[PDB]
Write a protein that binds this ligand. Structure first.
Ligand SMILES: [Cl-]
Ligand SMILES: [Cl-]
Length: 619
């Protein structure tokens, strides 16, 4: 019969090898029990044990001492013998019966302590021992003569803490050792084979890579007679440490992305754009490899005005995305064959039976006129995006048309299905216990369909967004975003050793459209930044850029507390346009300023930050 004990937990390192968490080892004495060993039996061990170990402060309470004087049964007998007019109840009386003001040798007072500690253990439990820190002889003497203090043994326990660093948030947490195994999912684990008292990640990374992090568990079994009385504890095998884990993210860069966010947010908080803003989020990738460069964010409490840092924000919160999604939609055009190559449509106000016109930002000043898909992205035409929704539904626009909704349920799914190919509304496959997968309602109206066609309906996570543009920058091959780069062993000191196995990127699916369609998409994103039209939306991308950037900017509007029309200024982009090495999305919700969206501008400076970090040009 053997007892298990979690082993040194593995550690976590940023891209650079800077460490993120703390193991603090400390060898100590565990004491088992036994419905058998007994007051007397425990005293015997107490003294034997004090021959080894150090203890100055014995701030014993009286209630304790009482219990120790009563330890001799005779004693207890004789004590009760004296009380006048239920076991523990009558213990309760007898306990308080003896006036306790009575002497004990000062070294006395010390194994009375232990005894308290020893007694404190539940039957069959294995407890520890409020002691006085231990050297190496003191310790390894015990290593040898447990079997001479039937029960006792010394264990290596550990504290695990998280360092203050931008990534702290992501790391997650592990169960304390006083905690054990959190019932909730608790059972599922015993089935996977864990000792009950183990310590496991409760969330995020600590949980995600549990397999590999968990250090092989330490071991001891116990012997005893046909009568159950303890005979001695024993070590079959002491535990080792875990494997380690190196991240795709480099601190300094994540760090500097973050002030960039602060800088920009303060700007908007200053000039008042941000009064109603919940915050701002930004995520960066390698589009080809799916590695994460940084996930940054800033929560802003509207009540106290205070600003709190938030990185999980990327994977946990959802926003209406706005114009940043039109590609998805055009791409549903092509798959379902409503658009042919670079399709020409006519930009005109969209009006349905007895209801508000539906328009693009330019639409009413420019009257109606024709326009290519490439152009449609350039000027961010909703009409085109809505004429295309219509297409899927199988109808073609006439002014004032009644719409038969028979093809609706079918239509919304077709579109939605494409969005999901890009990562929008579908799981990313990120390496974490739980990404929220958007706000895609199944109960939806017709208005809902058409507004979904320009990203004013379904709600998306910032992490989803990055993936969607990353996919475009990859040529329609969606790669699962991962935060871990490689698993690494240990070195002689116990720090970052070296390569166990490098994690390779995993392809989620290819977006089925032609290359020539994909290139037609690429051209648009290119002209959203470099275009020379009075209508071009994102020349902001190109202002002061260190490399050629292609992106797509976004606004969606609305409601905003006791308000007030206001909008989101998200923006997705990648680069270099020629040979895309970084993909980014920035979401900046309920913005007040509505005039010049700082979403693109932010993403530019992110990219700029990165290339100033890791030059990407260099044919
Ligand atoms: Cl304004
Ligand atoms: Cl600017």
């Amino acid at each position: 019969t053997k007892i298990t004990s979690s082993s040194a937990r593995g550690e976590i390192y940023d891209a650079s090898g800077k460490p993120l968490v703390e193991n603090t080892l400390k060898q100590v004495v565990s004491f088992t029990r036994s419905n058998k060993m007994t007051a007397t039996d425990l005293k015997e061990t107490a003294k034997k044990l004090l021959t080894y170990v150090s203890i100055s402060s014995p701030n014993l309470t009286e209630r304790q001492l009482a219990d120790y004087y009563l330890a001799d049964p005779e004693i207890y007998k004789k004590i009760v013998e004296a009380l006048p007019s239920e076991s523990e109840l009558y213990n309760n009386a007898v306990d308080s019966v003896q006036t306790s003001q009575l002497n004990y040798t000062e070294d006395e007072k010390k194994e009375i302590y232990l005894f308290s500690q020893l007694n404190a253990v539940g039957n069959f439990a294995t407890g520890t021992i409020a002691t006085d820190p231990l050297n190496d002889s003191q310790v390894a003497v015990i290593a040898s003569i447990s079997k001479e203090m039937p029960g006792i043994s010394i264990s290596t326990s550990w504290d695990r803490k998280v360092l203050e660093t931008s990534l702290s948030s992501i790391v997650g947490s592990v169960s304390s050792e006083k905690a054990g195994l959190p019932a909730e999912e608790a059972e599922a684990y015993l089935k996977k084979g864990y000792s009950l008292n183990d310590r496991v990640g409760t969330s995020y990374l600590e949980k995600q890579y549990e397999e590999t992090l968990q250090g092989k568990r330490s071991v001891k079994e116990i012997h005893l007679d046909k009568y159950g009385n303890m005979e001695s504890v024993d070590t079959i095998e002491e535990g080792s440490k875990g494997n380690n884990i190196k991240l795709t993210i480099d601190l300094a860069f994540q760090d500097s992305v973050d002030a960039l966010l602060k800088s920009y947010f303060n700007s908007e908080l200053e000039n008042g754009g941000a009064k109603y803003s919940e915050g701002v989020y930004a995520v960066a990738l390698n589009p080809k490899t799916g590695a994460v460069l940084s996930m940054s964010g800033i929560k802003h409490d509207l009540k106290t005005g205070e600003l709190t840092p938030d990185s999980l924000g990327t994977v946990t919160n959802v926003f209406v995305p706005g114009s940043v999604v039109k590609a998805a939609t055009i791409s549903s055009g092509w798959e379902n064959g409503v658009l042919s190559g670079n399709q020409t449509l006519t930009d005109q106000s969209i009006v349905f039976q007895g209801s508000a016109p539906i328009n693009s930002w330019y639409t009413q000043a420019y009257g109606s006129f024709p326009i290519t898909a490439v152009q449609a992205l350039e000027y961010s035409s909703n009409t085109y995006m809505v004429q295309t929704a219509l297409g899927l539904m199988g109808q073609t626009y006439q002014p004032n048309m009644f719409v038969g909704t028979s093809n609706l349920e079918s239509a919304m799914e077709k579109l939605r299905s494409t969005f999901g190919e890009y990562g929008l509304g579908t799981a990313t496959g990120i390496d974490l216990p739980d990404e929220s997968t958007g706000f895609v309602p199944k109960e939806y109206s017709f208005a809902n369909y058409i507004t979904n066609a320009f990203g004013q309906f379904d709600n998306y996570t910032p992490m989803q967004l990055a993936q969607y543009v990353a996919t475009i920058a990859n040529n329609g091959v969606r790669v699962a975003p991962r935060i871990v780069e490689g698993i690494y062993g240990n070195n002689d000191k116990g720090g970052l050793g070296d390569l166990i196995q490098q994690l390779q990127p995993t392809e989620m699916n290819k977006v089925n459209i032609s290359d020539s369609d994909m290139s037609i998409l690429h051209q648009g994103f290119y002209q959203v930044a470099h275009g020379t039209s009075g209508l071009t939306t994102g020349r902001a991308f190109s202002n002061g850029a260190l490399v050629s950037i292609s992106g797509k900017t976004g606004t969606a509007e609305s409601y905003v507390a006791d308000g007030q029309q206001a909008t989101n200024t998200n923006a997705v982009a990648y680069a270099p346009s020629d040979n895309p090495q970084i993909a980014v999305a920035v979401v900046f919700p309920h913005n007040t300023n509505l005039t010049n969206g700082v979403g693109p501008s932010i993403a530019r400076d992110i990219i700029n930050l990165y290339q100033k970090y890791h030059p990407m040009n260099h044919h």
